[PDB]
Design a protein around this ligand. Structure first.
Ligand SMILES: CCCCCCCCCCCCCCCCCC/C=C\CCCCCCCC/C=C\CCCCCCCCCCCCCCCCCCC[C@@H](O)[C@@H](CCCCCCCC)C(=O)OC[C@@H]1O[C@@H](O)[C@H](O)[C@@H](O)[C@@H]1O
Lengths: 100, 280
């Protein structure tokens, strides 16, 4: 059996202009097994109604998902993606970064 | 070639928590573009586009359904039986991908490739179960113990060969509508995470573009730097993709650089963003 760590990338659908509604995206990929936990936070709180792709994998058999929710950024407002997988020691949190 | 998908295939992730607890997740694709969803606990389907069905009839469509629907129910019902037999340790997960694809002129090759343990397990070639060495005792054990079901094999061939391109070319056309459409880009430079304090992280985004193929380089006049780290084409929930592309350089040398951005949807009218000053 194999166990692949999930890879996490976060990003906005359009270059954010504070005060202007964007799309926060969180793309987990390359993990395995497919049981995973994903959330998208706002200042550390799990944002509510979020949509996400349907399970799907790649040639090497690793799965990936696209989590994303509409949001309106500011100078303040810290946003991050919290991933939890059998292969992780403790929930992994990657924060968004307008610059990154 | 003609711009868009070149294959359609289904996908199956059946996860086995234990002898009586199995959960299977299926879906239908065209490269990355998912056009078919399978609502599970019911047994139906989810067409995500008018052209999801493909020049196929509400009569044949609804026909495939039961095949799939029952296959799933059966596939699980079975695995749990031979679970001890093939000495499976719970929990395990088995994946499956199968479909056909077009190729450089007019020869349509299909495929059905299964996995277990996140590993290769079996491949169908010239209509016949082929035990990926990756499997072992069990792969042969199954590949063989399964050939002895001509009906199953019967269905497998038809769909896989007969029913597939008849459908493939079918939807591709049925939906050449927006499958060949063209969405131009976006773009916006930005600098962040400094390498060796005194150097700079030139970051050139590019979003919303469709089709997927795309060009992006941190050039300086006629020429490029190529030290340019082309990122991964991640995706947007809308059928378009995102794409970072960093550049590594020193304080001064930054200024005077730009991000060129070709694309099938721009027509020589590339995107150029020069590396301005101060205001990020
Ligand atoms: C008795 C069998 C014993 C088996 C022992 C197994 C021991 C387990 C050890 C571990 C082995 C790992 C093996 C991994 C194999 C992976 C195969 C994956 C293949 C394909 C992916 C399928 C994706 C499914 C979800 C798709 C969702 C699509 C949505 C919409 C469709 C919209 C229209 C477009 C149509 C386009 C079609 C494109 C081509 C696709 C072709 C894919 C192949 C489909 C195969 C369908 C065969 C139907 C078979 C069933 O009749 C049968 C299955 C039995 C299990 C074995 C399957 C092996 C496959 C190689 C079945 O169970 O019949 C049950 C009977 O039902 C009743 O009549 C009655 O109660 C009884 O007679 C039976 O219950």
């Amino acid at each position: 059996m194999i166990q692949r760590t999930p890879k996490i990338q976060v990003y906005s659908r359009h270059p954010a202009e504070n005060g202007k509604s964007n799309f926060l995206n969180c793309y987990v990929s390359g993990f395995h097994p497919s049981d995973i936990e994903v959330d998208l936070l706002k200042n550390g709180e799990r944002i509510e109604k979020v949509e996400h792709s349907d399970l799907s994998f790649s040639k090497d058999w690793s799965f990936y998902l696209l989590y994303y929710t509409e949001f309106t950024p500011t100078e303040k407002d810290e946003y991050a993606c919290r991933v939890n997988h059998v292969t992780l020691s403790q929930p992994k949190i990657v924060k968004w970064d307008r610059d990154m | 070639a003609f711009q868009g998908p070149t294959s359609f295939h289904v996908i199956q992730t059946s996860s086995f928590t234990n002898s009586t607890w199995a959960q299977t997740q299926g879906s239908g694709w065209l490269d990355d573009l998912q056009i078919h969803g399978w609502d599970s606990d019911s047994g139906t389907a989810i067409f995500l586009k008018p052209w999801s069905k493909g020049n196929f009839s509400d009569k044949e469509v609804a026909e495939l359904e039961e095949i799939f629907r029952v296959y799933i129910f059966g596939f699980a019902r079975e695995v749990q039986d031979f679970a001890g037999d093939f000495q499976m340790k719970y929990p395990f997960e088995i994946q499956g991908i199968a479909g056909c694809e077009l190729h450089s002129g007019g020869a349509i090759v299909s495929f059905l490739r299964g996995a277990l343990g996140g590993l290769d397990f079996l491949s169908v070639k010239n209509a016949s179960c082929v035990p990926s060495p990756e499997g072992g005792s069990r792969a042969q054990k199954f590949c063989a113990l399964i050939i002895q079901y001509q009906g199953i094999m019967e269905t497998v061939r038809i769909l896989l060969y007969e029913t597939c391109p008849r459908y493939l070319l079918g939807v591709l056309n049925a939906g050449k509508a927006d499958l060949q459409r063209q969405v131009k880009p976006e773009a916006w430079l930005s600098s962040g995470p400094s390498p060796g304090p005194g150097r700079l992280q030139l970051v050139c985004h590019v979003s919303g573009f469709y089709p997927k193929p795309v060009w992006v380089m941190w050039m300086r006049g006629e020429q490029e730097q190529q030290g340019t780290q082309l990122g991964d084409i991640l995706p947007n929930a809308n059928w378009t993709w995102y794409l970072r592309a960093t550049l590594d350089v020193a304080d001064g040398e930054a200024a005077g650089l730009s991000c060129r951005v070709k694309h099938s949807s721009l027509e020589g009218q590339d995107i150029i963003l020069y590396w301005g000053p101060g205001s990020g």
